[PDB]
Design a protein around this nucleic acid. Structure first.
Ligand SMILES: Nc1ncnc2c1ncn2[C@@H]1O[C@H](COP(=O)(O)OP(=O)(O)O)[C@@H](O)[C@H]1O
Ligand SMILES: Nc1ncnc2c1ncn2[C@@H]1O[C@H](COP(=O)(O)OP(=O)(O)O)[C@@H](O)[C@H]1O
Ligand SMILES: Nc1ncnc2c1ncn2[C@@H]1O[C@H](COP(=O)(O)OP(=O)(O)O)[C@@H](O)[C@H]1O
Ligand SMILES: Nc1ncnc2c1ncn2[C@@H]1O[C@H](COP(=O)(O)OP(=O)(O)O)[C@@H](O)[C@H]1O
Ligand SMILES: Nc1ncnc2c1ncn2[C@@H]1O[C@H](COP(=O)(O)OP(=O)(O)O)[C@@H](O)[C@H]1O
Ligand code: ALF
Ligand code: ALF
Ligand code: ALF
Ligand code: ALF
Ligand code: ALF
Ligand SMILES: [Mg+2]
Ligand SMILES: [Mg+2]
Ligand SMILES: [Mg+2]
Ligand SMILES: [Mg+2]
Ligand SMILES: [Mg+2]
Length: 1603
DNA sequence: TTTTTTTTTTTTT
DNA sequence: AAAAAAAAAA
């Protein structure tokens, strides 16, 4: 075995043998721009230095001779061939092997070894592994010839990805398995880092692994540096290896060899070995001896005979000049074209993009990809080159292209139908040799044939990528031999499941990465402002791959909208930087002559002096370029016209034509129904045949605006379709907006794929002109609905969208059909820069949309008292049609639409077309109104004059103006509808006007004034509703009232008590049918929601309510610990639930109400600091949103008997929003309905009020509201009569064998549920025993009375708070004592670290059996509880001071604890008391969570001292019941805490006895049954102490009297 | 043998 | 201001 140096010393050591083996086969593979070519050339250089003959096979068609020479290759003697077929390439090798003249042969990319049949054939249908079988044959033939010739052969290979291999690594190597086996050495090279120079990237840090070794031990690895333009930093390696072997001394930063100091820092040491080649050889030799795991151990005149013989053979076989010496091959020299950016041309090193090569540009949407491309076309045409554009993205605007300076009339252009078509076109135009530069707009948009022909959902695993990989092989060869440049524009996609690196990729697999000679990364970095205006995009491009010069240089510049790249701008800056232009502050001078004042003018001057500009540019290029470059055309047009004939008789009548004459390319627009928006769009409206996205917050105007454009389009007679995936569109309101309901096609689809497939049908039909999809948010994938809630479908939704886009773009343009997607806003979490807002359904839509709108409600349109509309602002966020970032404001008047004439007045006054004399409005001298109100109304009345003003405004303000047959349309229309319905169900799509299931039905809320405030008269069936508010506000109560109401009409209800707090007895008191109310206390949140989904689908339940979304704890959270952070897991769960439920709730006509709690958002100073648990999903999907608040107390002299209540309608999809209702909740009774009725009746003048007297129709019915209410109670007949008239008078949107089948599907659902979520997860409330309320004595009798129930509730949460030393701990211990006396097990959590055992015992606690913990962290404390709860062994747990619950890291912690504990505490019947401190200006530590979840809340206070003449022996104490979910709240108890004894029981007994008249109090004397028992409370207490018998007797009577 | 494709979401005085 | 865990396609 003999070896050759690789040019890397460390690699030679890693090889064991000291180099690569002669007469053997070697493979090198790795990622793109890793070093494969470079390394190869270094070994050639090395071999030539010893005088060996080399050959290079540049199948990749990418080798740069000049760079090869820079690496130290003898160009003039390096044999080189760019073969046409793969067989040719290999046959050449076999000849050169057999010749025995060549010593080393390298083949650049087996990847590029395209079989003959593959080029000869098409692009599209393949021949899988007619390339692997070819390789396998080549190997067999070559092995023998290579050994007997002692000739080394190196194959360079690229990396591809084996799909979904979850066992080893997903990487392979092109050309099958043949090469793996035959190779004696296999190398894996990778770029691991950058070799930096402060600012500059001057090289690639490199690592090679020996992956196969037949010559020595395998799996050794070598690292080194590739210095761009120099090669492998050999001396660098040598320094390091030398120091490592102790041959070179390193004294800190000083390097010594044999006592002589040779450098300071690796930099100089390297340079020294460079200067002493003699000493360098000496060190290298010793290193090789020290580290090589094996030693190696008249004539050439015959070689040249057989050499020349082989070359003659080859050329008379494969063409005139198939193989020649690299140094003389002219077609190998690199030529460049300007990019239209000067700084980019400098960054490229070569001065521009390389001819006959492949280039990729990628970046975010609206970054400059298309624009930049067109600038290079413009540039190339200016020098007279022929260009072609492939608008696969179907989005190129001819007018804008011309504004950028492109010759439209001569720019060849094609909008292809399939991806294969697009690429086949290229291959024709390449081979033609007529075209010089071709650009393909979006490889993203290169949809494979099978994908368009298939459905949406049809999965084509890496079909797209495999197509690209084939295209590359075929094109490389044809592009070089034609000297034709090809630029691919690409989009960015996110790769999911990557935590290192960057999460960005590029569509169309890995093929393009490798074949591209240049790869550009363009990004918009800032806005080019004009005080107010945004006139351009600040832009930065990174050279990410470079086969032509050094990579990783970057260029910045400006794209001025409507003009292009600011070239002269660059030139000024570059000139000043190089000292060619003088800058004296704000003055710019060139060669003494002053040329401008400020960059603005200097630029304009260079514009005016093109001659001087060229002169400066040239000098800059000379000063700053890293690699300076350097009868006939009548034949071109022959082969051109020949290619075009070929193409059109292959891909259709007019598949390719000159851009300037293609009519279907011009842009047409439709009014949005907002004038100012039309101006902001520049073009005057939305573009036909394109895609548009509108997004914004909930109830912002997305649906409404959409309908207005439909209305507008129908007014001109266009056919529209609406896809109500959100399942929320109200036909009546749509009509009020002016939509033709009867002719508006409409579909509520079941799956997302269905929705999109429908579009694709309606697009292709060419019958529909405008289609709108309501909420991409609501486009739920098939698998998601078919799966459960919790089933994770990682970016399945987004991948679906991305496929939809590809298919739709083509069909929408060729049909001239507009498509608008409405989208919702979600928050992205873990972003601190930028804005935290996104858009559902991934990145696909961002790119494909031609217009992107951001709509927001900015204010209320008021009417003194009334809110009659939403002040609205829309921002143009993306614009492919005109300049972006203009914004429009206007009014949406509820029930009317966009105030168009409003806009018109304002715009008219602003342009001085309408005169405004204070409050008076004049047009052409004629006064038309007084105040905007009337002026608007006047333009309404004079539509003729209105058109006249509008037209002038449009002329004045539009930056981009535009100005037998239908019987065939209805054929293809009806054809599409038949298709659809026989595919997606009986009535999946129909005319809105006849769809009955679309009409709106309502249910009473149990509050009359709320029903009026709703406009519709109640809550909407088959929709989602949210009620939120502060704690004890009325949320649960109100809910139950609607259930009661619905049951009274015989509807089936279900309740989901996730809050675990519903009291059956109170529910019954409110008038609910307990025995028939289905009820579930679920364990996880997913369980709760899955239950709903079952009950929805069942169609048996009519109304479902979920108590606290706050309490919908995700599975993982319960299964995890307290402290385990689940970032927005809860919210993501909700968002999934919404998608699944909307569809099932409408088709079942089932109402769903979510009760929600209020949390505070922290770090907000504007607005209100209040939110709602469970993210943003529910905001959007809810058709009604209610805000309920307790505003006052309903008093009874002394007693508090109810809560004065106010509800605000905060969202309304059913009627006008923002009306509010007030009423009374009477504790234990419910909403005072008749109360409302009296007030409403008096207000409408139906009931007469003469001071305190109430009369109806002359008959006096009461004295004061009290009696009047009671009278209507007694006359239900007359009450109905008054209510009906009130409803007629005040409802703004007036309303709209069989049940035996229901119980079949009901029972079926319940069986399903219980065999899924446990033995008794759902049952009738009336029979659920675990739901009944049990109590424990507090140790204070008066407190037990004040509680109403007689004590604290088991299996619930309780909070006690108060000032310091008020009695919190003490009282707690008394209840423990009490509970232990009945034999319950207690636990105490002394987080306050202050509990005194001896005092606890004095209070009567069983110390020996009281479980007790002093925890270290707060999470620990709560986790302990959760364990003790779940154990079901402990009955009562108390936590001393939530104040003292210090988080580990040291409210969000509390909020998580609540969710987890509620469920575990009820199912264990375990009481939990939290003691809290005080921080009216009073609060409670640990946020708002506990307020809501507590069933009882106590306020204890020391009010006085219990004196003993001199001594203070106790604290006089008062407790207020502040919250009560168990009985009526706000009762208060007083008593005595005697220090060292406890709650002075006998004290209480004396007071209670005197109060009930059982004990006589004659001043200071206390008598019982005539017998005097004490003098002053002191002695009376002591007497009852002494007569325990009589004490029991009194207590018993008090209990009978007061319980 | 031949090949990738894609995000999803708040949480709290 | 400091937190992360998810996969199914010829
Ligand atoms: N002509 C050149 N001038 C300067 N640097 C180059 C040139 N060609 C390649 N390089 C650099 O050398 C490194 C490896 O290039 P190369 O060996 O072509 O990668 P591969 O062959 O693995 O695709 C890359 O960082 C690349 O930018
Ligand atoms: N027809 C037009 N008129 C004015 N500005 C435009 C037009 N088309 C695009 N632009 C602007 O040029 C910039 C880049 O657009 P483009 O080159 O189409 O990006 P990409 O192809 O990368 O999505 C954006 O700021 C965009 O708003
Ligand atoms: N049926 C209706 N009656 C009265 N006003 C409505 C109705 N539907 C919607 N609105 C009002 O129109 C505005 C926007 O509603 P919409 O277009 O549905 O918003 P989005 O679809 O963006 O959530 C809101 O202010 C809302 O109150
Ligand atoms: N079982 C009951 N007996 C008497 N009053 C009750 C009962 N349950 C609740 N209340 C009272 O009804 C009002 C609202 O209670 P609820 O609807 O549970 O509030 P929320 O669910 O909004 O926290 C409060 O004043 C509360 O004290
Ligand atoms: N170990 C003890 N011995 C005597 N008196 C005590 C003891 N602990 C508390 N007290 C008294 O009882 C009253 C209330 O105590 P405690 O219930 O601990 O108050 P809080 O828990 O509200 O701070 C105070 O006046 C206090 O001085
Ligand atoms: F790629 Al674009 F607007 F042309 F996102
Ligand atoms: F030489 Al390459 F991708 F194979 F840059
Ligand atoms: F998307 Al909406 F109200 F229609 F939030
Ligand atoms: F003494 Al304390 F809460 F203030 F127990
Ligand atoms: F029912 Al609550 F706070 F949500 F009392
Ligand atoms: Mg290479
Ligand atoms: Mg583009
Ligand atoms: Mg909507
Ligand atoms: Mg509640
Ligand atoms: Mg205490």
């Amino acid at each position: 075995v003999e070896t050759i140096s690789t040019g890397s010393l460390s690699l030679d050591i890693a090889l064991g043998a000291g180099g690569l083996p002669m007469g053997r086969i070697v493979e090198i593979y790795g990622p793109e721009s890793s070093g494969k070519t470079t390394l190869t050339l270094q070994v050639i250089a090395a071999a030539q230095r010893e005088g060996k003959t080399c050959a290079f096979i540049d199948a990749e068609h990418a080798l740069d001779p000049i760079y090869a020479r820079k690496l130290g290759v003898d160009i003039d003697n390096l044999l080189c061939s760019q073969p046409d077929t793969g067989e040719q390439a290999l046959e050449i090798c076999d000849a050169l092997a057999r010749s025995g003249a060549v010593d080393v042969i390298v083949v650049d990319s087996v990847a590029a070894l395209t079989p003959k049949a593959e080029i000869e054939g098409e692009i599209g249908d393949s021949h899988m592994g007619l390339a692997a079988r070819m390789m396998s044959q080549a190997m067999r033939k070559l092995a023998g010839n290579l050994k007997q010739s002692n000739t080394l052969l190196i194959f360079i290979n690229q990396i591809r990805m084996k799909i979904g291999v979850m066992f080893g690594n997903p990487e392979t190597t092109t050309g099958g398995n043949a090469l793996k086996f035959y190779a004696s050495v296999r190398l894996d090279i990778r770029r691991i880092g950058a070799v930096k120079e402060g600012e500059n990237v001057v090289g690639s840090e490199t690592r090679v692994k020996v992956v196969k070794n037949k010559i020595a031990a395998p799996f050794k690895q070598a690292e080194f540096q590739i210095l761009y333009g120099e090669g492998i930093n050999f001396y660098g390696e040598l320094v390091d290896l030398g120091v490592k072997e102790k041959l070179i001394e390193k004294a800190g930063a000083w390097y010594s060899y044999k006592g002589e100091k040779i450098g300071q820092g690796k930099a100089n040491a390297t340079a020294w070995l460079k200067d002493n080649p003699e000493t360098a050889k000496e060190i290298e030799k010793k290193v090789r001896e020290l580290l090589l795991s094996n030693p190696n151990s008249a004539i050439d005149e015959n070689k040249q005979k057989a050499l020349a013989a082989a070359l003659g053979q080859i050329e008379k076989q494969f063409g005139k000049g198939s193989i020649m010496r690299l140094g003389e091959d002219r077609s190998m020299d690199v030529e460049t074209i300007s990019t239209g950016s000067l700084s980019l041309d400098i960054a490229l090193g070569a001065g521009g993009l390389p001819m006959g090569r492949i280039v990729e540009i990628y970046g975010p949407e609206s970054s400059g990809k298309t624009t930049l491309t067109l600038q290079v076309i413009a540039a190339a045409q200016r020098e007279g080159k022929t260009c072609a554009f492939i608008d696969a993205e179907h989005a190129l605007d001819p007018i804008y292209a011309r504004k950028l300076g492109v010759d439209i009339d001569n720019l060849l252009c094609s909008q292809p139908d399939t991806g294969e078509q697009a690429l086949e076109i290229c291959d024709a135009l390449a081979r033609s040799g007529a075209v010089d530069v071709i650009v393909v707009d979006s490889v993203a948009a290169l949809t494979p044939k099978a994908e368009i022909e298939g459905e949406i959902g049809d999965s084509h695993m890496g079909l797209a990528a495999r197509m690209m990989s084939q295209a590359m092989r075929k094109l490389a060869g044809n592009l070089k031999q034609s000297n034709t440049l090809l630029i691919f524009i690409n989009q960015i996609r996110m790769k999911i499941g990557v935590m290192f690196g960057n999460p960005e990729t590029t569509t169309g697999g890995n093929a393009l990465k490798f074949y591209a000679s240049v790869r550009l990364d363009i990004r918009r970095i800032g806005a080019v402002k004009e005080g107010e205006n945004v006139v351009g995009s600040e832009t930065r491009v990174k050279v990410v791959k470079n086969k032509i010069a050094a990579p990783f240089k970057q260029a910045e510049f400006q794209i001025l909208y409507g003009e292009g790249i600011n070239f002269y701008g660059e030139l000024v800056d570059l000139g000043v930087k190089e000292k060619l232009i003088e800058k004296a502050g704000a003055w710019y001078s060139y060669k003494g002559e002053k040329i401008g004042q400020g960059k603005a003018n200097a630029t304009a001057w260079l514009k005016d002096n093109p001659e001087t500009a060229k002169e400066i540019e040239k000098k800059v290029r000379e000063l700053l370029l890293s690699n300076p470059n350097s009868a006939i055309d009548e034949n071109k047009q022959k082969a051109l016209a020949a290619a075009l004939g070929q193409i059109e008789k292959q891909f259709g009548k007019g598949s390719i034509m000159r851009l300037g004459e293609d009519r279907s390319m011009d842009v047409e627009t439709i009014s949005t129904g907002s004038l100012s928006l039309d101006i902001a769009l520049g073009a005057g409206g939305l573009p036909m045949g394109r895609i548009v996205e509108i997004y914004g917050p909930e109830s912002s105007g997305k649906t409404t605006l959409t309908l207005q454009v439909i209305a507008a389009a129908q007014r001109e007679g266009k056919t529209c379709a609406f896809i109500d995936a959100e399942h929320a569109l109200d036909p009546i309101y749509a009509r009020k907006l002016g939509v033709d309901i009867d002719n508006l096609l409409c579909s509520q689809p079941d799956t997302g794929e269905q929705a999109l497939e429908i579009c694709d049908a309606l697009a292709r039909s060419g019958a529909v002109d405008v289609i709108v999809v309501d909420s991409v948010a609501a486009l739920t994938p098939k698998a998601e609905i078919e799966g459960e809630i919790g089933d994770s479908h990682m970016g399945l939704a987004a991948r679906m969208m991305s496929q939809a886009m590809r298919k739709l773009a083509g069909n929408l343009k060729q049909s001239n059909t507009l498509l608008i997607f409405i989208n919702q806003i979600r928050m992205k979490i873990g972003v601190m820069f930028g804005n935290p807002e996104t858009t559902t359904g991934g990145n696909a839509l961002k790119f494909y949309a031609s217009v992107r709108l951001d709509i927001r409600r900015i204010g209320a349109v008021k009417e003194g008292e009334n809110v009659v509309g939403s002040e609205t602002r829309v921002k143009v966020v993306k614009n492919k049609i005109a300049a972006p970032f203009k914004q429009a404001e206007f009014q949406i008047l509820y029930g009317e639409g966009i105030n168009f004439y409003g806009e018109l007045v304002d715009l008219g006054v602003k342009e001085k077309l309408i005169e405004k004399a204070g409050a008076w409005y004049s047009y052409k001298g004629e006064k038309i109104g007084q105040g905007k109100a009337n002026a608007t109304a006047w333009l309404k009345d004079n539509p003729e004059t209105a058109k006249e003003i509008e037209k002038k405004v449009r002329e004045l303000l539009l930056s981009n103006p535009n100005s037998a047959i239908d019987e065939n349309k209805q054929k293809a229309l009806a054809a599409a509808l038949g298709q659809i319905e026989k595919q997606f169900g009986k009535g999946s799509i129909m005319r809105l006007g006849e769809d009955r299931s679309m009409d709106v039905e309502t249910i009473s809320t149990g509050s009359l004034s709320l029903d009026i405030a709703l406009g519709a008269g109640g809550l909407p069936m088959g929709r989602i509703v949210e009620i939120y508010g502060p704690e004890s506000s009325g949320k649960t109560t109100l809910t139950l009232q609607v259930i009661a109401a619905a049951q009274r009409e015989g509807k089936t209800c279900a309740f989901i008590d996730a809050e675990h707090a519903l009291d059956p007895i109170y529910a019954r008191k409110l008038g609910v049918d307990i025995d028939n109310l289905l009820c579930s206390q679920p364990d996880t949140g997913e369980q709760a929601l899955e239950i709903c989904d079952a009950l929805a689908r069942s169609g048996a339940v009519d109304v479902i309510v979920v108590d606290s979304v706050a309490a919908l704890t995700p599975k993982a959270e319960i299964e995890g610990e307290i402290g385990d952070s689940h970032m927005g897991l809860a919210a993501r769960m909700m968002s999934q639930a919404m998608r699944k439920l909307a569809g099932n709730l409408k088709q079942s006509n089932t109402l769903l109400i979510f009760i929600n709690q209020i949390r505070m958002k922290i770090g907000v100073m504007f607005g209100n600091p209040e939110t709602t648990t469970g993210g943003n999903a529910l905001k959007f999907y809810a058709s009604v949103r209610l805000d309920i608040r307790r505003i006052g107390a309903v008093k009874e002299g002394e007693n508090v008997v109810g809560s004065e209540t106010r509800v605000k309608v905060v969202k309304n999809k059913i009627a006008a929003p923002f009306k509010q209702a007030e009423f009374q909740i009477l504790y234990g009774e419910g909403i005072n309905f008749y109360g409302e009725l009296v007030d409403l009746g008096v207000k409408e003048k139906l009931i007469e009020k003469a001071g305190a007297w109430y009369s109806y129709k002359g008959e006096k019915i009461g004295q004061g509201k009290a009696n009047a209410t009671a009278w209507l109670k007694d006359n239900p007949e007359t009450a109905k009569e008054i209510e009906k008239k009130v409803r007629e008078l005040l409802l703004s949107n007036p309303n709209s064998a069989i049940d035996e089948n229901k119980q079949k599907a009901l029972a079926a659902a319940l069986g399903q549920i219980e065999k899924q979520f446990g033995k008794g997860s759902i049952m009738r409330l009336g029979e659920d025993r675990s739901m009944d309320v049990e109590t424990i004595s507090t140790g204070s009798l008066s407190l037990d009375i004040a509680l109403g129930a007689g004590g604290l509730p088991m299996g619930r949460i309780v909070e006690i708070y108060g000032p310091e030393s008020s009695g919190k701990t003490t009282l707690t211990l008394q209840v423990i004592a009490a509970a232990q006396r009945e034999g319950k097990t207690c636990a105490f959590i002394d987080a306050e670290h202050a509990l005194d055992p001896i005092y606890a015992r004095k209070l009567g606690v069983d110390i020996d059996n009281l479980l007790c913990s002093q925890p270290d962290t707060g999470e620990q404390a709560l986790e302990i509880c959760d364990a003790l709860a779940r154990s079901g062994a402990v009955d009562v747990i108390v936590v001393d001071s939530v104040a003292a619950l210090t988080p580990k890291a040291e409210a969000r912690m509390m909020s998580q604890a609540m969710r987890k504990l509620a469920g575990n505490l009820k199912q264990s019947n375990t009481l939990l008391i939290f003691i809290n401190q005080i921080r009216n200006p009073e609060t409670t530590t640990g946020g708002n969570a506990l307020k809501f979840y507590a069933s009882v809340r106590l306020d204890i206070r020391r009010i006085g001292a219990v004196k003993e003449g001199e001594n203070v022996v106790g604290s006089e104490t008062r407790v207020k019941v502040v919250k009560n979910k168990i009985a009526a709240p706000f009762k208060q108890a007083e008593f005595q805490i005697l220090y060292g004894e406890g709650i002075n029981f006998y004290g209480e007994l004396v007071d209670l006895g005197v109060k009930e008249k059982l004990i006589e109090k004659a001043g200071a004397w206390y008598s019982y049954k005539g017998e005097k028992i004490g003098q002053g409370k002191a002695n009376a207490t002591a007497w009852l102490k002494d007569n325990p018998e009589t004490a029991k007797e009194i207590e018993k009577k008090v209990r009978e009297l007061l319980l």
